[PDB]
Symmetry: D2
């Protein structure tokens, strides 16, 4: 089929990419970076996140694969030495696909009335423009809390091992269609009160963050982060869209967690 | 239908129970504490947990209701003043049912070879008999970690607001069929290593705790706690069984969380 | 003596300030905001922090007092209704003084070679300019760790109830001459490793933060926060200087903690 | 001088002990385990804790040394290969001494009226006899909080790297004369409230734990743990007594922390 290979850009990953392209030339495989059906990422999890956002408009037509030239990644979970066996199985096809849930983020603005939507593979976070961060947290149209602190992080399941984990969040197996909200340095005293605990939401629950004082926020989506002005609302929901991985062996999530944090 | 009412045993709850029995006498409602179809608990969440374990062999034939004579409970979420409206709607029927997932705990012994199974509505925990607690944690037959510490807690979704919450766990909406494992004071240094983070498992995942040095453990299931000796394995899995609640109004889980921890 | 009164600027605090000035006019008390010996702050803890940094060059010649027109503050711990009794005792004098330790922050730059020093009453923090925050942490010239995360917070004892507390830090009685370092969302996996725990340092210990990749950081000192460029080192040490409070009654730190976080 | 050597009891530590005794026989050094002035512990930190409590009645007449035959310990911080150089320097004398603060625990009983005092090198903890743990926490005769949870831990400075650390406590340099209180799984909801944060107390502050419902508690002091009945009060204070170490090289606390938790 059609395929493309993205590279971290260092000597190691570029050469592996050129050797894989040569190996694909021995099969009915066409290099196409406009409408690929297979997207191979060579580098780390950062490289894999860039590949996902490169092709986020053709998610349902693409199976992703990650190769780690550095340490083991959670998305880039193939070794460089397995590259030749990867070509053959990819060329033959008949592989299985695995799907992970994604996070939908909607940003509504003031001035007039317009929206922007983004898809996250790891998480979306909200912080302030330097000043104090105060937002009302609304869950399914019910006011839940007034958050004062540094920010908030909404993670996908496969994102729970990333930023979510550093904030105290739970690690969730990616077969659970859910999103998880964690706090960044919340203020809790006699007059200010947050839940503290991470919150895990199922499909069709909508979490809305609404400004109190300032309308300017730093909003990140995976590695992309930008200052949004005149923001009226930020809505989080489990996406109906899913990222599809090509799978060729059993590499269970909990072993990947074991290998990344316990020992390898 | 057939119904029974359990009471915390204080003057307030006993009198409310006698007044509800009188109110049921005005309808085709028969008091039966052997094969009830409706189980009303009057007291707190402790009273409701005792009612659940009272009738755990007829879970699929019972709809539970909780009335809180003290503060708001997560299971006992009806006010005493609503008792009269409760009788009528219960007597008429046509109510909806809501189902929450449960936790299955299997305890395998040595000596010969035998098993015991228990059902938890909140959580099951494992601690040592005074000595150091060391257990190997195995996830789907894969050795995940060697835990050294005070103990481990496996929570249901509706249990996440209880012991799980005090241990740093995430709060999970009860519509998610999952269980959550949290650590109690894990030892982490150069030679000893745990994941630290809470872990959230889906249906059909099996978490096994296996002894290393001692075979004696204090194992709790909700409020019940007992010293198990000659223990070879403790297995945790999302139960196929569910507790059914009678519902008459919308009282969302996240508002119940709000009312219990933020403000009311 | 000479005295000045700073105000939050709202109607309540301005009027209390004018009434106290009138009350001081009945005694040998001269209003002087250039070389005061008594500095009264009327507002909240934010107002008190501004007063401290207003007069940080004459710390050893000044006794500070805080009045809270809003809720109880940790520095602004007098009620407005006590204002008249405050004037008399302040005018008579013979009061006792209480001293709290402070934090010294030294910022060394590249380009050529120059330093800047700041004094913190609550804390000093370090974050990155948007990009990833990576710094080497050196304790008394010994490399202790390579920190990857959102940032670091170095707190005084009286600062431990502020930002430090939201980051998981311990609350320290202000009679202990010490500083406390806490982490903001540290990355910990197989290859990256921080201590995790807050660290409490005594007098004469020097903690140095040294850049790895980028030399630009957002450095805050109490409420003041600014982007420092070409930074070569940030050094933290318990200051030899102390802030002096005028005290007229016993209001113990742990009761102030109780009143602010438990109940009042 | 007079000296004794305690051993973990395994083949490695016993043989090292016999070789050191032989080496001391070449100097004016007398083996005496009744009134030693030098106490050498060969094993791990557990072995060193037993040696401390062995000779806790002659603390001011004893300099302790630890040798680790397993991994590095915080008290047993000499390698076995350094044993011969240890003998010579110990025999010659002229060494320096380093002193660490200790924790005093007083247990007052009912029935009649009697007290017991204990000294801790790491920590003292309080847990319940199975039932719920509820205690009133009083700081310098001021009621601070009503604690509901699994238990409480009061740590010395050198104890902060042990149990305290697993409970979220700060690591404190042992030159600070202080004690640190940490919570074990506190209950916090609308009606029950604890501070949450670790608390660090200076010398002469007295923390008192007082029973509410039950008078039976499991009280530990370092590795010793026993069920106390008819308990009326448990009082914690920084001891006036100090443990003295013989020091022959610079091995800073923060490097020892680095070596034990970061890398070695
Ligand atoms: N204070 C913070 N703490 C923890 N994580 C933080 C964080 N601030 C941001 N992030 C994460 O960085 C992601 C953006 N980076 C790409 C990635 C990735 C990635 N994904 C996963 C995953 N799913 N599971 C487990 N580890 C994962 N990692 C690893 O994360 C590490 C942290 N990153 C950096 O040091 C520098 N950042 C980049 O190069 C861009 C990397 O080594 C990476 O291998 C954000 O999306 C956020 O999650
Ligand atoms: N260290 C610890 N920290 C936190 N929770 C702990 C704990 N040790 C045990 N538990 C919990 O106690 C349950 C057993 N108790 C019945 C219940 C219940 C219950 N269920 C839920 C729920 N689903 N969500 C939210 N709050 C819930 N609560 C509330 O929990 C409080 C704590 N309990 C006690 O003080 C005394 N214990 C009992 O009377 C028996 C009560 O006020 C209660 O209203 C265990 O199952 C475990 O969860
Ligand atoms: N993510 C964060 N979490 C927690 N604290 C954070 C934080 N980011 C910054 N800070 C603190 O704010 C201080 C700067 N503010 C003045 C003050 C003060 C002050 N001092 C003490 C003290 N010693 N003990 C106990 N509470 C104290 N507080 C209270 O702190 C609250 C938080 N502040 C805000 O909401 C808005 N900020 C300001 O108006 C300026 C206030 O209600 C205040 O009454 C920084 O110095 C840092 O500490
Ligand atoms: N849930 C818990 N989490 C963390 N620590 C816990 C704990 N429950 C008890 N403890 C500690 O055990 C001490 C009693 N043990 C002797 C020691 C010691 C010692 N002292 C220090 C120190 N100062 N700094 C840093 N590490 C230190 N350690 C190390 O601690 C480890 C934990 N221990 C065990 O696994 C088995 N226990 C024993 O053999 C007896 C050991 O490897 C040891 O090398 C208690 O005093 C309490 O602190």
């Amino acid at each position: 089929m059609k395929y493309m290979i993205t590279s971290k850009g260092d000597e190691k990953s570029d050469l592996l990419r050129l050797n894989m392209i040569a190996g694909f030339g021995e099969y009915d495989m066409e290099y196409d970076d406009v409408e690929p059906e297979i997207v191979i990422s060579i580098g780390g999890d950062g490289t894999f996140l860039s590949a996902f956002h490169q092709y986020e408009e053709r998610l349902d037509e693409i199976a992703f694969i990650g190769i780690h030239t550095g340490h083991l990644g959670f998305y880039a979970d193939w070794r460089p030495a397995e590259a030749d066996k990867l070509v053959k199985l990819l060329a033959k096809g008949e592989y299985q696909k695995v799907s992970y849930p994604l996070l939908k983020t909607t940003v509504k603005y003031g001035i007039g009335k317009k929206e922007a939507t983004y898809l996250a593979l790891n998480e979306s976070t909200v912080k302030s423009s330097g000043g104090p961060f105060v937002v009302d947290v609304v869950i399914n149209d019910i006011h839940f809390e007034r958050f004062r602190g540094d920010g908030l992080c909404m993670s996908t399941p496969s994102g729970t091992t990333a930023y979510n984990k550093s904030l105290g969040g739970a690690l969730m197996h990616p077969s659970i269609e859910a999103m998880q909200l964690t706090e960044m340095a919340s203020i809790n005293n006699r007059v200010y009160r947050t839940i503290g605990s991470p919150l895990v939401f199922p499909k069709h629950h909508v979490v809305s963050l609404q400004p109190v004082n300032d309308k300017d926020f730093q909003i990140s989506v995976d590695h992309l982060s930008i200052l949004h002005r005149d923001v009226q609302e930020i809505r989080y929901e489990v996406s109906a869209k899913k990222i599809h991985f090509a799978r060729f062996r059993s590499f269970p999530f909990w072993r990947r967690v074991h290998d990344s944090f316990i020992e390898d």
